[PDB]
Amino acid sequence: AETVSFNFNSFSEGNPAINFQGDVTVLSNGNIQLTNLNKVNSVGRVLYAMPVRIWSSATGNVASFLTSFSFEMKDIKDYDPADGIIFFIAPEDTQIPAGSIGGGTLGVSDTKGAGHFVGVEFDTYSNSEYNDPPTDHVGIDVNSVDSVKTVPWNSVSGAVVKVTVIYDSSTKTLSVAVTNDNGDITTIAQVVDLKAKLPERVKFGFSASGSLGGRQIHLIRSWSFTSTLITT
Amino acid sequence: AETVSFNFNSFSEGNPAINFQGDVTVLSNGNIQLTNLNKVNSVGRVLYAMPVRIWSSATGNVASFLTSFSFEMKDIKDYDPADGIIFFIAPEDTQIPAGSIGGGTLGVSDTKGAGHFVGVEFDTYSNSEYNDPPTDHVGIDVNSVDSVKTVPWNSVSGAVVKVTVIYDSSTKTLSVAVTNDNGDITTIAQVVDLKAKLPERVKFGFSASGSLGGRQIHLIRSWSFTSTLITT
Amino acid sequence: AETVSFNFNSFSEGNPAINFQGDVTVLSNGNIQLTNLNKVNSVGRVLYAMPVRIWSSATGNVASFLTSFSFEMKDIKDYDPADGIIFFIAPEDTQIPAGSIGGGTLGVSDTKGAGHFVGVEFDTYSNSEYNDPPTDHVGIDVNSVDSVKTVPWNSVSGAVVKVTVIYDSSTKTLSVAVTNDNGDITTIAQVVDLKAKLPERVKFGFSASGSLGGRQIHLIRSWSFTSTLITT
Amino acid sequence: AETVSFNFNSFSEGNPAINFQGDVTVLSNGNIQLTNLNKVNSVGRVLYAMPVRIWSSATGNVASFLTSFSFEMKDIKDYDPADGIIFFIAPEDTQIPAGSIGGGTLGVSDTKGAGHFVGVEFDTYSNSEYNDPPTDHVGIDVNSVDSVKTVPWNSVSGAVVKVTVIYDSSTKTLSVAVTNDNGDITTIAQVVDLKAKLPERVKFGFSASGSLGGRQIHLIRSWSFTSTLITT
Ligand SMILES: [O-]S(O)(O)c1ccc(-c2c3nc(c(-c4ccc(S([O-])(O)O)cc4)c4ccc([nH]4)c(-c4ccc(S([O-])(O)O)cc4)c4nc(c(-c5ccc(S([O-])(O)O)cc5)c5ccc2[nH]5)C=C4)C=C3)cc1
Ligand SMILES: [O-]S(O)(O)c1ccc(-c2c3nc(c(-c4ccc(S([O-])(O)O)cc4)c4ccc([nH]4)c(-c4ccc(S([O-])(O)O)cc4)c4nc(c(-c5ccc(S([O-])(O)O)cc5)c5ccc2[nH]5)C=C4)C=C3)cc1
Ligand SMILES: [O-]S(O)(O)c1ccc(-c2c3nc(c(-c4ccc(S([O-])(O)O)cc4)c4ccc([nH]4)c(-c4ccc(S([O-])(O)O)cc4)c4nc(c(-c5ccc(S([O-])(O)O)cc5)c5ccc2[nH]5)C=C4)C=C3)cc1
Ligand SMILES: [O-]S(O)(O)c1ccc(-c2c3nc(c(-c4ccc(S([O-])(O)O)cc4)c4ccc([nH]4)c(-c4ccc(S([O-])(O)O)cc4)c4nc(c(-c5ccc(S([O-])(O)O)cc5)c5ccc2[nH]5)C=C4)C=C3)cc1
Ligand SMILES: [O-]S(O)(O)c1ccc(-c2c3nc(c(-c4ccc(S([O-])(O)O)cc4)c4ccc([nH]4)c(-c4ccc(S([O-])(O)O)cc4)c4nc(c(-c5ccc(S([O-])(O)O)cc5)c5ccc2[nH]5)C=C4)C=C3)cc1
Ligand SMILES: [O-]S(O)(O)c1ccc(-c2c3nc(c(-c4ccc(S([O-])(O)O)cc4)c4ccc([nH]4)c(-c4ccc(S([O-])(O)O)cc4)c4nc(c(-c5ccc(S([O-])(O)O)cc5)c5ccc2[nH]5)C=C4)C=C3)cc1
Ligand SMILES: [O-]S(O)(O)c1ccc(-c2c3nc(c(-c4ccc(S([O-])(O)O)cc4)c4ccc([nH]4)c(-c4ccc(S([O-])(O)O)cc4)c4nc(c(-c5ccc(S([O-])(O)O)cc5)c5ccc2[nH]5)C=C4)C=C3)cc1
Ligand SMILES: [O-]S(O)(O)c1ccc(-c2c3nc(c(-c4ccc(S([O-])(O)O)cc4)c4ccc([nH]4)c(-c4ccc(S([O-])(O)O)cc4)c4nc(c(-c5ccc(S([O-])(O)O)cc5)c5ccc2[nH]5)C=C4)C=C3)cc1
Ligand SMILES: [O-]S(O)(O)c1ccc(-c2c3nc(c(-c4ccc(S([O-])(O)O)cc4)c4ccc([nH]4)c(-c4ccc(S([O-])(O)O)cc4)c4nc(c(-c5ccc(S([O-])(O)O)cc5)c5ccc2[nH]5)C=C4)C=C3)cc1
Ligand SMILES: OC[C@H]1O[C@@H](O[C@H]2[C@H](O)[C@@H](O)[C@H](O)O[C@@H]2CO)[C@H](O)[C@@H](O)[C@H]1O
Ligand SMILES: OC[C@H]1O[C@@H](O[C@H]2[C@H](O)[C@@H](O)[C@H](O)O[C@@H]2CO)[C@H](O)[C@@H](O)[C@H]1O
Ligand SMILES: [Ca+2]
Ligand SMILES: [Ca+2]
Ligand SMILES: [Ca+2]
Ligand SMILES: [Ca+2]
Ligand SMILES: [Mn+2]
Ligand SMILES: [Mn+2]
Ligand SMILES: [Mn+2]
Ligand SMILES: [Mn+2]
Numbered sequence: 033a034e035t036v037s038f039n040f041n042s043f044s045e046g047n048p049a050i051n052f053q054g055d056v057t058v059l060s061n062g063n064i065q066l067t068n069l070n071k072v073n074s075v076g077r078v079l080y081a082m083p084v085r086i087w088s089s090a091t092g093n094v095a096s097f098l099t100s101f102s103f104e105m106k107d108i109k110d111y112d113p114a115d116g117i118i119f120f121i122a123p124e125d126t127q128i129p130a131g132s133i134g135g136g137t138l139g140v141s142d143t144k145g146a147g148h149f150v151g152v153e154f155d156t157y158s159n160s161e162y163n164d165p166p167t168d169h170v171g172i173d174v175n176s177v178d179s180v181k182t183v184p185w186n187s188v189s190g191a192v193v194k195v196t197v198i199y200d201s202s203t204k205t206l207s208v209a210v211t212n213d214n215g216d217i218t219t220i221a222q223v224v225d226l227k228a229k230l231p232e233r234v235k236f237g238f239s240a241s242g243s244l245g246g247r248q249i250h251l252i253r254s255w256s257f258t259s260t261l262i263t264t
Numbered sequence: 265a266e267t268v269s270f271n272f273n274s275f276s277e278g279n280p281a282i283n284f285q286g287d288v289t290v291l292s293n294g295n296i297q298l299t300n301l302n303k304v305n306s307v308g309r310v311l312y313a314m315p316v317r318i319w320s321s322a323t324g325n326v327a328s329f330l331t332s333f334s335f336e337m338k339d340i341k342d343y344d345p346a347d348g349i350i351f352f353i354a355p356e357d358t359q360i361p362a363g364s365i366g367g368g369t370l371g372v373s374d375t376k377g378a379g380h381f382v383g384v385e386f387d388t389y390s391n392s393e394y395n396d397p398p399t400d401h402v403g404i405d406v407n408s409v410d411s412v413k414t415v416p417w418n419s420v421s422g423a424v425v426k427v428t429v430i431y432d433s434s435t436k437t438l439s440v441a442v443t444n445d446n447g448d449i450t451t452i453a454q455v456v457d458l459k460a461k462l463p464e465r466v467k468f469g470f471s472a473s474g475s476l477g478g479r480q481i482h483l484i485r486s487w488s489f490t491s492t493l494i495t496t
Numbered sequence: 497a498e499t500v501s502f503n504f505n506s507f508s509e510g511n512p513a514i515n516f517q518g519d520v521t522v523l524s525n526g527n528i529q530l531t532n533l534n535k536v537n538s539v540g541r542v543l544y545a546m547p548v549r550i551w552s553s554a555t556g557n558v559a560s561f562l563t564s565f566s567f568e569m570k571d572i573k574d575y576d577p578a579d580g581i582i583f584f585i586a587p588e589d590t591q592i593p594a595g596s597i598g599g600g601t602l603g604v605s606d607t608k609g610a611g612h613f614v615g616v617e618f619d620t621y622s623n624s625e626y627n628d629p630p631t632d633h634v635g636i637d638v639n640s641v642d643s644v645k646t647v648p649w650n651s652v653s654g655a656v657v658k659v660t661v662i663y664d665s666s667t668k669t670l671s672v673a674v675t676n677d678n679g680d681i682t683t684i685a686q687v688v689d690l691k692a693k694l695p696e697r698v699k700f701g702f703s704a705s706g707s708l709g710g711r712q713i714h715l716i717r718s719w720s721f722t723s724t725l726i727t728t
Numbered sequence: 729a730e731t732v733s734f735n736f737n738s739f740s741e742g743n744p745a746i747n748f749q750g751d752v753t754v755l756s757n758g759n760i761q762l763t764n765l766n767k768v769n770s771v772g773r774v775l776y777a778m779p780v781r782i783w784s785s786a787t788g789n790v791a792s793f794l795t796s797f798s799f800e801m802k803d804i805k806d807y808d809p810a811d812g813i814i815f816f817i818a819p820e821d822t823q824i825p826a827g828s829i830g831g832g833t834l835g836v837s838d839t840k841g842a843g844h845f846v847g848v849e850f851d852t853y854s855n856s857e858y859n860d861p862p863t864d865h866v867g868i869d870v871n872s873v874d875s876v877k878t879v880p881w882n883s884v885s886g887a888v889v890k891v892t893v894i895y896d897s898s899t900k901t902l903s904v905a906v907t908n909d910n911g912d913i914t915t916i917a918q919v920v921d922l923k924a925k926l927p928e929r930v931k932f933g934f935s936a937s938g939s940l941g942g943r944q945i946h947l948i949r950s951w952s953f954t955s956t957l958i959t960t
Contacts, residue, residue, distance in 0.1 A: 222435070
């Protein structure tokens with residue numbers, strides 16, 4: 033088979049394996065701070081430098097992958113806790129949308145919240161302009177921040193969250209498991225046809241944004257990944 | 265919410281948190297050995313002592329759970345590697361099935377292969393008698409050792425395996441992810457209405473079995489489980 | 497190591513994790529009410545279903561635990577505020593003591609005040625019969641409602657109390673810390689060889705009681721416990 | 729009674745309630761980083777600005793106090809993970825020891841490892857000059873980094889540790905509970921007569937340190953404190 037795997041217990045802004053886009057910045061403790069606190073419409077993104085072949089136009093096969101990461105969101109005084117983080121998969125040439133308003137677009141969509149990407153957002157602000165549920169939530173996005181599905185969730189300031197994703201090729205079922213601070217788990221699943229919505233060669237990564245009045249600390253602590261494509 | 269969460273990195277007899285049914289023997293290194301090598305038809309199971317209420321006849325809700333565990337199956341000179349391990353869910357009153365012999369009921373069914381439980385199997389020996397695919401496989405059993413679905417897997421002697429399982433309360437999707445020694449990941453997923461096959465209170469555990477000519481060591485090295493039942 | 501850890505921010509009947517002995521009634525708001533207000537000699541207890549092995553006859557070791565919980569005791573027109581709540585440890589086979597009447601056995605002892613258990617009491621009514629200090633107090637009981645040690649405390653109707661308990665495996669020191677509504681903290685500590693007073697397997701819970709003339713509401717709002725038993 | 733209490737969920741540089749002594753620095757996410765990864769014998773300390781009256785001259789009374797905090801230590805490449813963190817209590821005019829060598833001294837002792845303070849160290853480097861145990865440990869210090877008592881412990885790089893301390897005046901008992909990322913809890917208690925080892929007015933705080941090759945990320949994330957002195 034064709035297997036891809038990596039593991040980051042910490043980061044550094046000189047590692048060739050990571051692509052930094054936007055106001056991204058690496059802290060002294062090894063964490064990645066996606067957005068700039070005192071910047072209007074801040075947008076930061078981070079992608080694994082190397083492109084993962086998730087499916088073969090040849091065989092007709094699709095890869096299965098298991099990844100898990102942990103992040104932290106914290107409130108900053110006088111500023112609305114927004115907008116959130118999103119784990120995304122996109123074509124290898126993915127860029128921050130030209131003139132991106134930031135905020136509710138999470139840095140992977142245009143003003144009408146559209147774009148070419150599949151992702152799991154950890155939304156902390158309700159954008160009626162995107163059909164956002166009235167409360168914090170977790171969602172499965174498929175080429176739009178107007179989630180195909182969401183599940184109520186609760187963002188605790190300054191608490192480390194742990195996430196475990198699984199994509200089973202056979203069923204094209206993307207399943208998420210989120211371990212909240214109080215021990216409680218939150219799950220959400222959706223059937224997404226990756227071959228159908230993305231190219232053979234893509235890229236994974238994290239993005240986060242905010243507005244002028246909406247800002248908060250977005251930190252990625254660790255990230256491990258392993259994809260496996262059957263070649264037969 | 266109502267959440268159950270335990271974690272075992274080692275084991276030891278006498279712990280009130282675990283019930284040992286069968287030829288289960290705890291090694292002097294905190295490892296659980298499921299079957300007796302010197303017996304014909306050995307059978308052993310390890311269960312988490314307390315019944316966990318997976319769904320509520322009142323809420324109508326069904327819990328989601330995130331459980332991951334590791335095991336090892338080493339071969340033994342002049343013996344067919346069998347029958348394999350199995351992670352399962354059963355009615356709180358679950359008694360250990362009748363030991364059988366040439367058989368491979370994985371310790372959860374009768375000679376015919378029937379039984380009241382739902383589980384993920386890591387089978388290493390084919391039995392025309394239960395539709396066992398030609399080779400080693402990972403399956404999804406629902407009241408029968410004749411898996412509902414199966415996927416090609418390969419068991420490697422003396423290799424430690426890591427397994428992450430996720431269950432989505434809504435989508436009723438059971439998603440497994442097998443991480444092998446070399447790195448490659450195997451995954452399978454299936455819908456199983458837990459509220460349709462199991463009583464409100466069930467029990468989680470691992471089971472194994474052997475035959476007259478099929479035997480091997482079945483080691484459960486670690487186990488961590490977490491389930492959350494929304495009720496409101 | 498061998499660790500037990502649960503967490504309840506709310507309660508609900510039917511949860512297999514908790515056993516209800518006596519006049520325990522679960523409110524429609526996830527709160528536990530220990531005594532019945534319309535009964536003479538009400539008595540109620542709530543216990544964590546599974547027995548926790550506090551010490552090993554093999555290791556000689558004794559587990560340490562960190563448990564914290566919150567409660568509330570509101571008065572009721574024309575009634576003496578009593579008897580108080582109590583956090584205790586008992587032999588796994590613990591039955592609920594005989595309901596008594598003028599009495600104040602806190603639901604863990606006989607008419608005389610004897611019983612097999614060890615606990616921290618939050619007593620709000622003096623009984624010359626058991627040496628109750630002149631006023632409200634927090635005590636450390638060891639097989640007797642006649643506290644081994646006591647410290648002046650003051651119970652305030654309708655106030656939510658936070659309590660953090662720590663037990664050191666070695667020093668055999670049980671240390672309580674009562675946080676009142678206004679802020680002030682009350683603390684008491686006592687050596688109690690858990691391995692000397694209790695059998696290997698015990699049970700943790702909260703108990704309460706009332707009299708003919710003494711009654712009040714006893715609410716257990718939340719509970720989080722964690723114990724670790726070193727074994728190697 | 730006289731009670732002192734505060735609570736921090738994140739710190740800031742321009743906060744007169746906190747005294748920053750040494751290589752201290754406050755990250756963008758509100759955490760405090762006690763040492764500088766680039767200096768040689770980097771020493772950092774942070775004290776609560778206002779002094780606390782732990783014992784009354786008039787009345788041979790001493791205060792009880794409850795406090796809990798969480799930290800994170802991480803390994804930095806090419807440097808030994810050292811030296812650790814310490815929660816200390818010192819006279820209100822306390823400073824960094826003249827010409828401190830940092831390292832084994834944890835920034836609160838001279839070269840012989842002596843000074844004026846009562847602390848709880850989370851040691852990560854075995855120094856034979858201070859009779860350190862051979863493994864990571866938690867210790868109780870009384871005017872010397874040569875612990876009056878210690879307990880084996882394990883520091884995990886990048887993991888959030890939660891700590892809870894309780895000091896009972898009546899017993900002059902100091903008990904700690906450390907909650908590892910693991911879920912496991914480590915404990916350690918010691919009887920320290922504060923009035924006998926410290927001045928009426930003290931200051932509480934944290935500290936960390938490193939050497940030439942011994943360096944790591946030391947971070948304080950939160951800190952809550954309450955102390956109540958009886959005055960009758
Ligand atoms: O007549 S026989 O019976 O004998 C017989 C002859 C040939 C075959 C082979 C074959 N491919 C081989 C290699 C190979 C492997 C190793 C070595 S070696 O190790 O070096 O020796 C040498 C050669 C090989 C290497 C790369 C590819 N094949 C790639 C490919 C290209 C580009 C990319 S890309 O874009 O990513 O660069 C990605 C993948 C493709 N192959 C197909 C394809 C196909 C499927 C469906 C449809 S359709 O029906 O239309 O859907 C259309 C086309 C077929 C159909 C038959 C077939 N490939 C599509 C893409 C070796 C044999 C089988 C039997
Ligand atoms: O009749 S006979 O008995 O005579 C007989 C004749 C031919 C065959 C073979 C064959 N493939 C071989 C290699 C091979 C192995 C080792 C070496 S060696 O190392 O040199 O030894 C050299 C060559 C080989 C290597 C790689 C591939 N084949 C790849 C492939 C390409 C790209 C990728 S990827 O992932 O990189 O993109 C992954 C996989 C493919 N092969 C097919 C394919 C096919 C399937 C379905 C459909 S259909 O359903 O109709 O669409 C259309 C086509 C067939 C059908 C028959 C067939 N391949 C599709 C992809 C060797 C033999 C078997 C029996
Ligand atoms: O009937 S016969 O005469 O035919 C006959 C049948 C079977 C046996 C064997 C046997 N083990 C073998 C290997 C082996 C050797 C060489 C190769 S080869 O070189 O590759 O060929 C391959 C395999 C082998 C390899 C590893 C082990 N055995 C391990 C083990 C597992 C896991 C770990 S771990 O955890 O560290 O990973 C560490 C160690 C154990 N084995 C026991 C054990 C046992 C003891 C006491 C109790 S009790 O009663 O409860 O006290 C319960 C169970 C028995 C009982 C019988 C028995 N093992 C416990 C642990 C080969 C044969 C002997 C005779
Ligand atoms: O229900 S199930 O389907 O699950 C099922 C459950 C159990 C069984 C088996 C069984 N024995 C086997 C072998 C075996 C055969 C072939 C190979 S192989 O060749 O490798 O294939 C490997 C192993 C096997 C080999 C040797 C023996 N059994 C010997 C024995 C040992 C030593 C000597 S001696 O004296 O010579 O040393 C003499 C005899 C005995 N076996 C019994 C015995 C018994 C007799 C009377 C009474 S009672 O009435 O109470 O008195 C009580 C019990 C039973 C009862 C059941 C039973 N044996 C008594 C002695 C294989 C299976 C089968 C099916
Ligand atoms: O026999 S008699 O006739 O004599 C008789 C004896 C006792 C009662 C009372 C009673 N409540 C009172 C106050 C009260 C009265 C007067 C003053 S005064 O004005 O000062 O005098 C002050 C306070 C009072 C105040 C607040 C509440 N009660 C709240 C409550 C609190 C918080 C929240 S929350 O979540 O919003 O925080 C939500 C709800 C609840 N009360 C119930 C409840 C219940 C219903 C169904 C189910 S079940 O079917 O099982 O589901 C379970 C439980 C009952 C059942 C009987 C009953 N309450 C559930 C919630 C006073 C009397 C009635 C008649
Ligand atoms: O026999 S007699 O005639 O003498 C007689 C004796 C006792 C009673 C009372 C009583 N409650 C009173 C107050 C009260 C009123 C005014 C003041 S005053 O203003 O100070 O004067 C002070 C105090 C009072 C205040 C708050 C409550 N009661 C709350 C409550 C709990 C929790 C919360 S909260 O928010 O924490 O959740 C909020 C509210 C509850 N009360 C019940 C309850 C109950 C119902 C069903 C079931 S069951 O069997 O299960 O169906 C079990 C239990 C009963 C049953 C009898 C009863 N309450 C459940 C919740 C005053 C009297 C009436 C008559
Ligand atoms: O073991 S312990 O020590 O714990 C202990 C446990 C229980 C008891 C009590 C008790 N009753 C009390 C009051 C009371 C007194 C004073 C005040 S106060 O003054 O306010 O303080 C407050 C409350 C009290 C008031 C009214 C009644 N009791 C009424 C009653 C109600 C209504 C009417 S009516 O018809 O007029 O409406 C008529 C009679 C009855 N009581 C019984 C009865 C019984 C009789 C025969 C049979 S059997 O032989 O089996 O058939 C079965 C049961 C028993 C058995 C035990 C018992 N009552 C039958 C009717 C106070 C305590 C004492 C000690
Ligand atoms: O017999 S009579 O009935 O006539 C009678 C007369 C006097 C007393 C009082 C008393 N103190 C009062 C205040 C007070 C309170 C409120 C207000 S008001 O609210 O303003 O009105 C006004 C005044 C008061 C305020 C501050 C102090 N007292 C301080 C003090 C000073 C400095 C500090 S410091 O360091 O923090 O600055 C800390 C503490 C001390 N007081 C003693 C002390 C003592 C104990 C043991 C020993 S020994 O045996 O040697 O051990 C030596 C000394 C005694 C002994 C008796 C006594 N104090 C030691 C320190 C009010 C009355 C009782 C009975
Ligand atoms: O004749 S009678 O019998 O009738 C009789 C006469 C006098 C007394 C009183 C009394 N103190 C009062 C206040 C008071 C209360 C409220 C207000 S109000 O608010 O205005 O109303 C105003 C004043 C009062 C306030 C503060 C103190 N007293 C403090 C004190 C100071 C500083 C601190 S601290 O912590 O801040 O440093 C903490 C505590 C102390 N008081 C003593 C003390 C003592 C103990 C042991 C020893 S010995 O063992 O011998 O050494 C020697 C001395 C005594 C002995 C008797 C006595 N105090 C030691 C410290 C009011 C009355 C009682 C009965
Ligand atoms: O409040 C956070 C929220 O802001 C929205 O945009 C606001 C903008 O922040 C505010 O300054 C302006 O006056 O009105 C805008 C429209 O509500 C973002 O659109 C949303 O995504 C959050 O970031
Ligand atoms: O190894 C960490 C350890 O260092 C000790 O000091 C060393 C110093 O780090 C090294 O660079 C120098 O060459 O020798 C010194 C003497 O051992 C510290 O004393 C100790 O506390 C740790 O920080
Ligand atoms: Ca949003
Ligand atoms: Ca089989
Ligand atoms: Ca009492
Ligand atoms: Ca040291
Ligand atoms: Mn959304
Ligand atoms: Mn099978
Ligand atoms: Mn008492
Ligand atoms: Mn030390």
